[PDB]
Write a protein that binds this DNA or RNA. Structure first.
Length: 830
RNA sequence: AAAUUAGGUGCGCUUGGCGUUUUAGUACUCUGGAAACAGAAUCUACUAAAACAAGGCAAAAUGCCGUGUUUAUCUCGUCAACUUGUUGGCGAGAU
DNA sequence: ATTTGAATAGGCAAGCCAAGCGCACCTAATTT
DNA sequence: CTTGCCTATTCAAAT
């Protein structure tokens, strides 16, 4: 509308805050938040890594099948050939001297092609007992094969150590080719095979694609978002800049073109990096707090808690005034704090820097004499007690070694340039007011370009991440995630009011112009007065009508299910159950088995099936009951792993134990991949696409549509009709039932008059849906209350449920009760 | 703006050993037998073969795709798509 | 008066890591 | 760290 305004933006990892304020009065017009999932690099790294793995496995399978065809052609393999009980390690070692049978020969060649070593690993010739190192293993093996073939070494381990496969099974392809050439040299005599056979086979065995070959044949008005794709960014940042642009486009359409935009990109790059910094900061804070506590313990002076900054500076400065180099006794500082003042190294009026790096603890008299001068200017004047040269030496000494000063502080202390030069002031302004990061520069260049071309008088600006926090401290406005997502929005409104301060104060005109990248304060009290409490912060703080817009995901063909495979079993009561496994039996702090034996001995399969080994294990648990892991003591004291019961003490070690786990309900059945499987083979965690609510004779009901239920066709996805009608039948949804709505992740749902956002279907069977709150996470809602419930909301949809309505927000967070189509969606072109 | 050295961020490609699971064999257990061995059990271990996001192509091939990005809703107009009455683009409106 | 079913609280588990390559753009230092 | 989903515990309604 006609009225002119400013647009604040607080860009973040998961959020874009926005604030809109009247250009004349500085009253709040509007304010809201646009929330999204952080775009993690892990996600695509996953997709790529799995695409790599799928090709590796495809190519192994295809190599084995190319070998078979060659054996069919030279009439060494048939449809009706028994390869079943032929140990290929025996057949490899035998065939380097004597005649193999056609079957042994086929067994051997097929075993080689399956597993054929690395081709791109050179000797390190070093051994630091690293099991997982390929280079160290390849080398250890190269030494073992000085006089023998791979199959000779492999058969030796099979007989001595009882096993072959594992980490030590890492050999060079050239070591394998040396064997194959010999095998084929011997066997060429007795079998009819020619140099064409031998050449073909070794090619199959040794050959692979290069990085520069890659796959085979088939393989693949308003501000635009395509310009973000041009200049390269972190995915986390790249998402936010696309979100931000669409939030600017929506504000422009509604309210018209802003006079001024001003932007703040968050400090942190991702949540983890932030956590690390926070941890580092907390680590730093703890040290200061411990010292403060020590001071209070030793001196009894409680006022130390109010002199944190002075004490920090005191310790930093070895208890000396940096201008006079006279001692600041800690006791005197505590008793007479007014004798010592915190001074800005570079006058705040020039640098706009209020950071700890621009602060020093000095005597009140020295502070008065320095005035609005740098240490260099002051110490070069007739007013100083010491020479600049003496000062400089001291600072340089402080910078080298223990009790160090930051680089930035050192530079400020040793600033010799003329403060009064525009170029120097520009440098300070750019450092303190204007954000200097490749992304932030990239964004404002995108925007400024856009407005320039289309001839729209819009002043894009930026402010430093730190700066907002200063104003919060200044105007007594405590930041806290506690409250909810609103903090992001009330950051935006602050940013927007800083713009008002950098327009109404003619004394900030230079700073304003610098921030607008346009081509070209005498006292501390004056500086302080410019930024004083407006009254309009009461408006910001007391404001209520915030708006939230969570983004809704409708993408088909996301992760369908979990990777892991599970066997099943029918128990005594005739309930199919997942089989679990206890691994890591001989670990110091592992109480899993000891807990299981005391609670539920009948859950072990060996309880039923190997009673003698069970009784043998129980005597150990009784022997070393007092410890966490009885088996650890068994291994420590005797020096021998637990073996299966046997009459002659020749049973194998026990390394995993299978026991009956949860009952089987919601699963994916993969048992047809395993011909003649006695039990059932399954996968778990059917991941949801959406759920479709129906109103049936006054009863609310719903169907879960799984991602498994959605199938790619030519250029579109289709919800499977048979799976869908089957699903309705298990839910007993009539043919005369009205479709109400479909709910995707983060879709908004009003259940019995209470609005939430959808997470998913907790239990299809019990008819429960997991939701979350809108303005705050339910976790945090409980924390601020100090409640100790589980931090998850579940809602049952039942005969008791009275109304279900779907809502929707625009990108700005304007809320709408929305209409639905008459039927569910089946086709999805996007 | 270029060069040199060191690191980073990202996209993509090529491999290797494993891991999970089934079937078989062998060892372990039980029964019978002078013994070879036959049967029972499917528990613990090794070896082989096979499957590993559900699937979809392709057809002797160093064969190919399947977990990312973009994504408020509904109506009307228009262009298109294949699924032939729906859902994509563009425009307009409402929520 | 006791037993059966709904709702809420409590809790578990989720494929991995080592070798190589290209290209892209950024930063820092130094010189022009 | 979040989510799909099972188990166990506690209270009210029905035989």
């Amino acid at each position: 509308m006609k009225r002119n305004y400013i647009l604040g933006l607080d860009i973040g990892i998961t959020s874009v805050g926005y604030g809109i304020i009247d250009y004349e009065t500085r009253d709040v017009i509007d304010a809201g938040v646009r929330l999204f999932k952080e775009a993690n690099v892990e996600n695509n790294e996953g997709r790529r890594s799995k695409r790599g793995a799928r090709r590796l496995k495809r190519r192994r399978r295809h190599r084995i099948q190319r070998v078979k065809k060659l054996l069919f052609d030279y009439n060494l393999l048939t449809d009706h050939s028994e390869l079943s009980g032929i140990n290929p390690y025996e057949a490899r070692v035998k065939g380097l001297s004597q005649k193999l049978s056609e079957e042994e020969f086929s067994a051997a060649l097929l075993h080689l092609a399956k597993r054929r070593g690395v081709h791109n690993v050179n000797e390190v010739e070093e051994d630091t007992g690293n099991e997982l190192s390929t280079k160290e293993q390849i080398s250890r093996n190269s030494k073992a094969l000085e006089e023998k073939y791979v199959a000779e070494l492999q058969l030796e381990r099979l007989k001595k150590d009882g096993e072959v496969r594992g980490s030590i099974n890492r050999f060079k392809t050239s070591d394998y080719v040396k064997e194959a050439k010999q095998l084929l040299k011997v066997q060429k005599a007795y079998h009819q095979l020619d140099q064409s056979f031998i050449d073909t086979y070794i090619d199959l065995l040794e050959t692979r694609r290069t990085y520069y070959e890659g796959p085979g044949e088939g393989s693949p008005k308003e501000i635009p978002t395509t310009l973000v794709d041009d200049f390269i960014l972190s995915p986390v940042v790249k998402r936010s800049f696309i979100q931000s642009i669409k939030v600017i486009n929506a504000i422009i359409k509604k309210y018209g073109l802003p006079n001024d935009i001003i932007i703040e990109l968050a400090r942190e790059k991702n949540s983890k990096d932030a956590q690390k910094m926070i941890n580092e900061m907390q680590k730093r804070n703890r040290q200061t707090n411990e010292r403060i506590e020590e001071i209070i313990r030793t001196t009894g002076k409680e006022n130390a808690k109010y002199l944190i900054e002075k004490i920090k500076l005191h310790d930093m400065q070895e208890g000396k005034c940096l201008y006079s180099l006279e001692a600041i006794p800690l006791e005197d500082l505590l008793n007479n704090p007014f004798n010592y003042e915190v001074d800005h190294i570079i006058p705040r009026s020039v640098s706009f820097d209020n950071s700890f790096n621009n602060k020093v603890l000095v005597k009140q008299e020295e502070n008065s004499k320095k005035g609005n001068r740098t240490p260099f200017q002051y110490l070069s004047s007739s007013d100083s007690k010491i020479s600049y040269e003496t000062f400089k030496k001291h600072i340089l000494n402080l910078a080298k070694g223990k009790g160090r000063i930051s680089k930035t502080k050192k530079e400020y202390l040793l600033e010799e340039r003329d403060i009064n030069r525009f170029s120097v002031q520009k440098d300070f302004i750019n450092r303190n007011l204007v954000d200097t990061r490749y992304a932030t520069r990239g964004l404002m260049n995108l925007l400024r370009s856009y407005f320039r071309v289309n001839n729209l008088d819009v002043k894009v600006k930026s402010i430093n991440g730190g700066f907002t926090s200063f104003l919060r401290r200044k105007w007594k406005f405590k930041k806290e995630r506690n409250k909810g997502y609103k903090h992001h929005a009330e950051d935006a409104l602050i940013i927007a009011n800083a713009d008002f301060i950098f327009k109404e104060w003619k004394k900030l005109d230079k700073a304003k112009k610098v921030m607008e990248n346009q081509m070209f304060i005498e006292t501390e009290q004056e500086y302080k007065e410019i930024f004083i409490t407006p009254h309009q912060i009461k408006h910001i703080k007391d404001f209520k009508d915030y708006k939230y817009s969570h983004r809704v995901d409708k993408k088909p063909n996301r992760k369908l299910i979990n990777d892991t495979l599970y066997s099943t079993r029918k128990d005594d009561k005739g309930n199919t159950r997942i089989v679990n496994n206890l691994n890591g039996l001989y670990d110091k702090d592992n109480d899993k088995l000891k807990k299981l034996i005391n609670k539920s001995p009948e859950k072990l399969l060996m309880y039923h099936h190997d009673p003698q080994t069970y009784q043998k294990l129980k005597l150990i648990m009784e022997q070393y009951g007092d410890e966490k892991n009885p088996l650890y003591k068994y291994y420590e004291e005797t020096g021998n792993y637990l073996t299966k019961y046997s009459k002659k003490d020749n049973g194998p070690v026990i390394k995993k134990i299978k026991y009956y786990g949860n009952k089987l309900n919601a699963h994916l059945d993969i048992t047809d991949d395993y011909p003649n499987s006695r039990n059932k083979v399954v996968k778990l965690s059917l991941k949801p696409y959406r759920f479709d609510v129906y109103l049936d004779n006054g009863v609310y009901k719903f169907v879960k549509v799984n991602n498994l239920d959605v199938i790619k066709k030519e250029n579109y996805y289709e919800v499977n009709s048979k799976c869908y009608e089957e699903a309705k039948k298990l839910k007993k949804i009539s043919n005369q039932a009205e479709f109400i709505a479909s709910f995707y992740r983060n879709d908004l749902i009003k259940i019995n008059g209470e609005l939430y956002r959808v997470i998913g279907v907790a239990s299809d069977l019990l008819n429960a849906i997991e939701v979350n709150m809108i303005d705050i996470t339910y976790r945090e809602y409980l924390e601020n209350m100090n409640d100790k419930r589980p931090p998850r909301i579940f809602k049952t949809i039942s005969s008791k449920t009275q109304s279900i309505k779907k809502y929707s927000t625009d990108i700005l967070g304007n809320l709408y009760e929305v209409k639905s189509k008459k039927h569910p969606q089946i086709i999805k072109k996007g």
